[PDB]
């Protein structure tokens, strides 16, 4: 090694520094919070009725165990796009809460359901924040939503004196004023009803056909994760150089006991270089330090 480091077959007397070494890790451990029930996620997809964009519908999911792989075996979705997380690795993660939003839209307006878009939908009906992580799903429902008699129940806010806030909900239906003299609860040229019906007809060109859309938001906080993928827990080992994954966070190191007086609302601590130093295990209240494995020249 010395010879090949100097590009020469002969070396003079001396001390040569040519390489470094690291202790390799010897075991891998997995330690996930144990949830004792399946997840009724199908409720949000198997439902007959559906919401209207003026009053979109939300569901909050917690305490669940769910496998997303089926969503990639299924081919019933006209559109499937996720942002901020790789869709294949969702089985290896955990979250504090999951939120589902649901509504029917004009297919032409699918362009509007993205962070930072603009238009009547993105400003008067369902404004989405510019910073986002989640996934968005659509499928065409023209067969069921529309009928030979037409369907006109679905309404969208046509006019609005302002633009909504992100995830804002507003059932107020004050008569919109487009005239010099304001009129309240009156039908006239000055003011008219602020919502317009979607006229869904069964022969409409595809762009006008109704598409059902659902948006899934993953939310994670120092509040301990309650929903996790179907991964399995494993025994715990200490004072040896080991690979670990706690609650979605991977790494390698030497786990040890610690005397850090974490408060009940806290989970982990960070060093100046912004790396994890100590953690609270999801199955016991003990606090563990992580120390890197030995290395040197």
């Amino acid at each position: 090694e010395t010879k090949c480091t100097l590009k020469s077959f002969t070396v003079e007397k001396g001390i040569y520094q040519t390489s470094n070494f690291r202790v390799q890790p010897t075991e891998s451990i997995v330690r996930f919070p144990n949830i004792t029930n399946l997840c009724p996620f199908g409720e949000v997809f198997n439902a007959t009725r559906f919401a209207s964009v003026y009053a979109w519908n939300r569901k909050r999911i917690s305490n669940c165990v769910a496998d997303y792989s089926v969503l990639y075996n299924s081919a019933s979705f006209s559109t499937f796009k996720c942002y901020g997380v790789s869709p294949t690795k969702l089985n290896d993660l955990c979250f504090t809460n999951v939120y589902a939003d649901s509504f029917v839209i004009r297919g032409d307006e699918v362009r509007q359901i993205a962070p930072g878009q603009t238009g009547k939908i993105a400003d008067y009906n369902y404004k989405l924040p510019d910073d986002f992580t989640g996934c968005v799903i659509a499928w065409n429902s023209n067969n069921l939503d529309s009928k030979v008699g037409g369907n006109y129940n679905y309404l969208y806010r046509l006019f609005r004196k302002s633009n909504l806030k992100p995830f804002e909900r507003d059932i107020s239906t004050e008569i919109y004023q487009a005239g010099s003299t304001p009129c309240n609860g009156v039908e006239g040229f000055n003011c008219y009803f602020p919502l317009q019906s979607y006229g869904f007809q069964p022969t409409n060109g595809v762009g006008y056909q109704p598409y059902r859309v659902v948006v899934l938001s993953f939310e994670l906080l120092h509040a301990p994760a309650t929903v996790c993928g179907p991964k399995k827990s494993t025994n715990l080992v200490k004072n040896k150089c080991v690979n670990f994954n706690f609650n979605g966070l991977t790494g390698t190191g030497v786990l040890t006991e610690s005397n850090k007086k974490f408060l009940p609302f806290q989970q982990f601590g960070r060093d100046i270089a912004d790396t994890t130093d100590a953690v609270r295990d999801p199955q016991t209240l003990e606090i563990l330090d992580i120390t890197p494995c030995s290395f040197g020249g």
């Epitope: 029930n37 399946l38 997840c39 009724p40 996620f41 409720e43 997809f45 198997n46 089926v70």
Partner: antibody, heavy 120, light 106 residues
Framework: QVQLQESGPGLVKPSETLSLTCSVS????????WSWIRQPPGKGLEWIGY???????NHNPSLKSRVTISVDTSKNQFSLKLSSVTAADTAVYYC???????????????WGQGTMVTVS | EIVMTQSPATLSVSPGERATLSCRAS??????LAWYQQKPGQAPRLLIY???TRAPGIPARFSGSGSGTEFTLTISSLQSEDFAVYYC?????????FGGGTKVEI
């Protein structure tokens, strides 16, 4: 956690109605479905119906006119009634909670203790 | 409508050996089965709720796989406490069905 407890008669006469009742403890009928199931002695299981928080319900395709189910919000109780019963209807009856994963039919995960019914 | 059959009706087994079982549906089905254990006089337990996946609380002694025609389940290192009836089930379509079941001896 939740508990399922159930009650009904031990003996019934031919050609008269039969009724059973199952009550939930530790939770409420908010989302998860419920379903009645029967197990004839030494035979395969059979599903007879399911109902959820909305009151909408579906029963076994056969014996369309034989079975009805009513759900009460008060006291977290639901009951089943059969128009009449026969010597073949002797079985253990179970009430069980049902979770809908994604599509199809809901999988039964929590099961009641079961109660025996016989006709003579 | 979907009908389903389970064979054989009984397997003779003695402690310290693996066992294998298979259940078939009249028509193609995938990722839409369950395996239920039935110990004497007990309520059923849900052990397997899909293709090759274990419900939370079930040791890795139980496992299974399958194809559209037939599905199989293996119990490695069978023990005396594994004496039970096993019932395959499907839920892909409205006509729910249970399999015939199999007794596994001591």
């Amino acid at each position: 956690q939740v508990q399922l407890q159930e009650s009904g008669p031990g003996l019934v006469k031919p050609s008269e109605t039969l009724s059973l009742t199952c009550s939930v403890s530790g939770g409420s009928i908010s989302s998860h479905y419920w379903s009645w199931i029967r197990q004839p002695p030494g035979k395969g299981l059979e599903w007879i119906g399911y109902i959820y928080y909305s009151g909408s319900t579906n029963h076994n395709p056969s014996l369309k006119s034989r079975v009805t189910i009513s759900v009460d919000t008060s006291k977290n109780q639901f009951s089943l009634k059969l128009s009449s019963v026969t010597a073949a209807d002797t079985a253990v009856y179970y009430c069980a909670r049902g979770v809908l994963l994604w599509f199809g039919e809901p999988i039964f995960e929590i099961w009641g203790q079961g109660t025996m019914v016989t006709v003579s | 409508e979907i009908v389903m059959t389970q064979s054989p009706a009984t397997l003779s087994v003695s402690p310290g050996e693996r066992a294998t079982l298979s259940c078939r549906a009249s028509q193609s089905v995938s990722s839409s089965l369950a395996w239920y254990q039935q110990k004497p006089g007990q309520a059923p337990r849900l052990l397997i709720y899909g293709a090759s996946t274990r419900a939370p609380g079930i040791p890795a002694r139980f496992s299974g796989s399958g194809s559209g025609t037939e599905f199989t389940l293996t119990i490695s290192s069978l023990q005396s406490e594994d004496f039970a009836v096993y019932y395959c089930q499907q839920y892909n379509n409205w006509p729910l069905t249970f399999g015939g079941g199999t007794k596994v001896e001591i």
